[PDB]
Paper text:
Eukaryotic protein synthesis typically begins with a specialised initiator methionyl transfer RNA (Met-tRNAi) that is delivered to ribosomes by the translation factor eIF2 as part of a larger preinitiation complex (PIC) with multiple other translation initiation factors. Only by re-engaging with GTP can eIF2 participate in further rounds of Met-tRNAi binding and protein synthesis initiation. This requires the action of eIF2B. eIF2B first removes eIF57 and then acts as a guanine nucleotide exchange factor (GEF) to activate eIF2 and facilitate Met-tRNAi interaction and rebinding of eIF53. Structural studies of eIF2B have shown that it is a decamer or a dimer of pentamers. eIF2B has a central hexameric core comprising an eIF2Bα homodimer and (βδ)2 heterotetramer that is linked to a pair of γε heterodimeric arms. Here we have used single-particle electron cryomicroscopy (cryoEM) to resolve the structures of eIF2αP/eIF2B and eIF2/eIF2B complexes from Saccharomyces cerevisiae to an average resolution of 3.9 and 4.6 Å, respectively.
Author numbering:
A (entry chain F), D (entry chain E): 192 to 381
B (entry chain B), C (entry chain A): 1 to 305
The structure:
């Protein structure tokens, strides 16, 4: 669910003629209305694609040479905040197999903040669409997650519109586009 | 008429307060040097302060915080020597800048806490190592914030510093234990976050403080617990080692001599280790939260020419 | 007529020699139990020795070497109960086997050295941890072999054992220093080989001895220096933990209580850690050099049924 | 220079029809009379082969999915003693990229000994064929090596004629074919 990776993976076949294939997992139950649309849009421009589910990505992790992340926001660590789900663990399986991890990102997606407490920057969603029983009285509690954080250690490079950058060189782009003053953007200076 | 060298000015006010530390004491002594001894010529002023910094390093060499203070004083007199006031105002302009460190660096330690309280979240068991008083300046405001946490304090063999924390924040009212320094690997699977405090930052981000912060750092990496370090902005130093071995204490870290009759045998290995930039993950200064490549740039820009 | 329980037989001969250790003392006490108290019936013999092993564990629980000795004694009386002599000879046959441990396990420690001298090669700086006397039984024959090496001895906080080695093989004439236990990470880049000694071996190969052998093990792994352990064959024990935390001492390894007035604060964390099978790479017993999966098979075969 | 890997990599194409390719490095100056013969014998049965040199194996280590070792002798650790050279470092680059490492071995190649001192079980050869200048008086000293040891950590599986085995399960095959007595095979029992 990122238009950046979609336009890039179309234009990698449209102008350049680099043929490849793209495994894609679904972030059930969020990207399962998007990953199939993603595969449809890539099969219209017919790049050899195939959909894996979430549980079957470690078996196919040894075959794949590279992952790529279309993120939502990226902090001064390079610890980004992504789309719907999946990426907190599949990027970890990428790091453990020493597989490189990309991250395309627009320059507006930056943030001069810091992940102080990481759960506060993570949007846990609703428990409706992970079990549609709606258990009345037995009522087994459950947890959903619509935001997966990655740390900068698991991630390898940042492809932005102003060049390629290390995860340990995301602070200086922020201070090239932000100041020291508006990070505690609050009139009540405590 | 004092001569500001060893103890006729410097070591006197170290007995005035056991809250001021070594580098800002060095800053205070070096500014009160030329606050009085200013013989109306830009030549011998810098010769006097360079001679004073080198004899003060010659006093105690194994306390590298002193080198950090005595070299950021040179950066202060260089940038205040810049703006080019033709030395006519700078005899007054530099000395009226002057005490802005003892009005600034003295009150930096609560400015540390005002940005570092929002790290220790609810119910975090915390590991600290050594009497690093900026860590306690964070923890004091954390406990005054009424946030719920627990602390674990290591030993500081042979430098005794681990016994001070358990008699420091216990009476503040925090549930705290005192682990022994060798028991880190059996407990760091349970410790949520680990703080240390540096006695120096190298040109890449390094912890040059105590005996075994490299050991607790490499335990933090192979437990994948975040390894933060609380410091402040008078701790930058040019000394950039490459091994895990710094300048020596008096000989190598691996002695093999003979004890004569009954001399001391504990302090026979090293006492100040080094940590590479990989093991630290975020450091805290007056300049905000600061990733180690940012502290590398900050110590790479104000030290080139 | 002694009752063999606590100190009327056991703790007496611990004062006879400060060279015999705990588990073979337990073996000696348990064989001299039924060497005299043999009331001509196979029923109450085993009840007596099982009661004796459980009260002897009930005496001192936090010395798990005792559990190793008191359980390999049960393996001895089980296999000597096997071969099925109808108990008519076994009243004499078992007791004439009897003292074959105190003729066998007492002289096992030089049999350790006869196969472990060919590990410490020429000019190897050696790291040992804690007073593990089988390591010194190897090192004694190594220095008697006239081979050239150097040794480094860690502290053993809080159990004091690191001060004993520097007053043990110095007078043998080996160049040795005493590092502090927190300084491992700054020196283990230079140490060629590292030895420890276990107070127990789990069902996968584990080191259940002291405060921080997991810390020196994980330092040995991230320096990629070989981590050997010298032990002997009365140190197998059934206790197979899964965490880095064993049976407790008296409470959890993370206390958070209140010191009342001035009670002791050093021993507040754990004192016996655990090492997984990955960090050890070869262990030495009476059974030859022994990879940890081989010690897992050797402790998996004689303990099933 | 192993007939085991040669017969196996021929019969993997002769009976089975699994097509692949084989990078091969030369152990200069020892396998350079053998690795080219190895490539000739594989090009006769035409399995897509290509020769890399020694220095160009780290660049191509990311592409390759698997290495294989035709060893000479293997100890009770699984720390084997190989042929001419190369394998002490390229297996390390395999371990660091989390690439699996095979080791085919006949059962006669076992040894119930132990690598006590690892240099004593390593055959350093002669300095003639690494610089043919034969420097008379300047005489720059130099080192050759005709035996590369691997530790058991860098190696992954043992393919023998009695099944596949862990590197940590090589002791029990030895004690299934040897005894405790003949490891110190010497009349002068010291």
């Amino acid at each position: 669910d990122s238009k950046t990776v979609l336009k890039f993976l179309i234009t990698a076949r449209e102008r350049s003629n680099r043929t490849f294939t793209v495994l894609v997992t679904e972030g059930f139950p969020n990207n399962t209305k998007n990953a199939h649309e993603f595969a449809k849009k890539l099969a219209q421009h017919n790049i050899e694609t195939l959909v894996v589910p979430d549980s079957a990505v470690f078996a196919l992790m040894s075959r794949v040479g590279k992952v790529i992340i279309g993120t939502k926001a990226v902090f001064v660590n390079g610890g980004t905040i992504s789309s719907n789900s999946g990426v907190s663990s599949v990027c970890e399986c990428a790091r453990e197999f020493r597989t490189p991890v990309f991250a395309v990102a627009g320059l507006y997606k930056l943030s001069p903040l810091y992940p102080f407490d990481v759960e506060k920057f993570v949007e846990f969603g609703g428990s409706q669409r992970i079990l549609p029983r709606m258990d009345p009285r037995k009522r087994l509690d459950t947890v959903n997650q619509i935001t997966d954080y990655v740390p900068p250690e698991n991630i390898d490079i940042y492809i932005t519109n102003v060049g390629g950058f290390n995860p340990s060189f995301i602070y200086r782009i922020a201070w090239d586009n932000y100041k020291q003053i508006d990070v505690h953007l609050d009139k009540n200076k405590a | 008429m004092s001569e500001f060298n060893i103890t006729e000015t410097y070591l006197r006010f170290l007995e005035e307060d056991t809250e001021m530390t070594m580098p800002i004491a060095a800053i205070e002594a070096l500014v009160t040097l030329l606050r009085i001894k200013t013989p109306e010529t830009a030549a011998e002023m810098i010769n006097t302060i360079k001679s004073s910094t080198e004899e003060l390093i010659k006093s105690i060499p194994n306390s590298v915080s002193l080198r950090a203070g005595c070299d950021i004083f040179m950066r202060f007199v260089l940038r205040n020597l810049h703006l080019y006031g033709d030395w006519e105002n700078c005899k007054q302009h530099l000395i009226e800048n002057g005490q802005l460190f003892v009005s600034r660096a003295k009150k930096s330690r609560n400015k540390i806490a005002e940005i570092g309280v929002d790290f220790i979240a609810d119910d975090d068991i915390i590991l600290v190592h050594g009497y690093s008083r900026a860590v306690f300046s964070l923890l004091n405001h954390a406990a005054n914030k009424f946030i719920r946490f627990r602390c674990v304090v290591t030993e500081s063999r042979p430098s005794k510093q681990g016994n001070q924390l358990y008699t420091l924040l216990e009476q503040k009212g925090i549930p705290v234990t005192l682990i022994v320094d060798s028991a880190v690997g059996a407990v760091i699977d349970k410790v949520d976050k680990v703080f240390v405090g540096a006695e120096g930052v190298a040109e890449s981000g390094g912890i040059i403080n105590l005996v075994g912060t490299y050991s607790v750092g490499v335990l933090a990496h192979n437990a994948r617990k975040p390894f933060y370090v609380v410091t402040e902005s008078h701790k930058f130093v040019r000394m950039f080692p490459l091994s895990s071995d710094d300048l020596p204490m008096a000989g190598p870290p691996l002695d093999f001599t003979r004890r004569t009759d009954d001399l001391e045998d504990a302090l026979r290995g090293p006492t100040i280790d080094y940590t590479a930039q990989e093991y630290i993950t975020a450091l805290i200064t007056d300049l905000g939260v600061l990733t180690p490549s940012a502290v590398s740039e900050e110590l790479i820009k104000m030290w080139y020419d």
